[PDB]
Amino acid sequence: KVTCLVCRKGDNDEFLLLCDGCDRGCHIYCHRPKMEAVPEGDWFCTVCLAQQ
Amino acid sequence: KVTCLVCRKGDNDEFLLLCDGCDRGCHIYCHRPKMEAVPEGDWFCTVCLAQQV
Numbered sequence A: 001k002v003t004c005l006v007c008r009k010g011d012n013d014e015f016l017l018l019c020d021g022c023d024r025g026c027h028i029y030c031h032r033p034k035m036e037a038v039p040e041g042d043w044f045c046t047v048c049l050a051q052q
Numbered sequence B: 001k002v003t004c005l006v007c008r009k010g011d012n013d014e015f016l017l018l019c020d021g022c023d024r025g026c027h028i029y030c031h032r033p034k035m036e037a038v039p040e041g042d043w044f045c046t047v048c049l050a051q052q053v
């Protein structure tokens, strides 16, 4: 059940990015820098980025 | 002079993530979700994420 790392909510799930490497998520509107849309391809959360 | 996308400042450059797709940047402390350190390998800014398929 995906939830936003920033605000901790799982609401508005059409706007939740799901990490490609783990179960974590983020609303595009909670992300900084700002994101205007859900991107295609792969998005990695900061925990996954910290492992690469 | 790289500037942060969030706060628009170019200070504390040791804390500035640099995009591998363009010349944009972001302080780790301005990033959300939390970024405690500059990662190794690659980081893409939101403008570049929007070009992916």
Ligand SMILES: [Zn+2]
Residues within 6 Å of the ligand: A004, A005, A006, A007, A008, A009, A026, A027, A030
């Ligand atoms: Zn959120």
Ligand SMILES: [Zn+2]
Residues within 6 Å of the ligand: A019, A020, A021, A022, A023, A024, A044, A045, A046, A047, A048, A049
């Ligand atoms: Zn992840």
Ligand SMILES: [Zn+2]
Residues within 6 Å of the ligand: B004, B005, B006, B007, B008, B009, B026, B027, B030
């Ligand atoms: Zn900044």
Ligand SMILES: [Zn+2]
Residues within 6 Å of the ligand: B019, B020, B021, B022, B023, B024, B044, B045, B046, B047, B048, B049
């Ligand atoms: Zn970029």
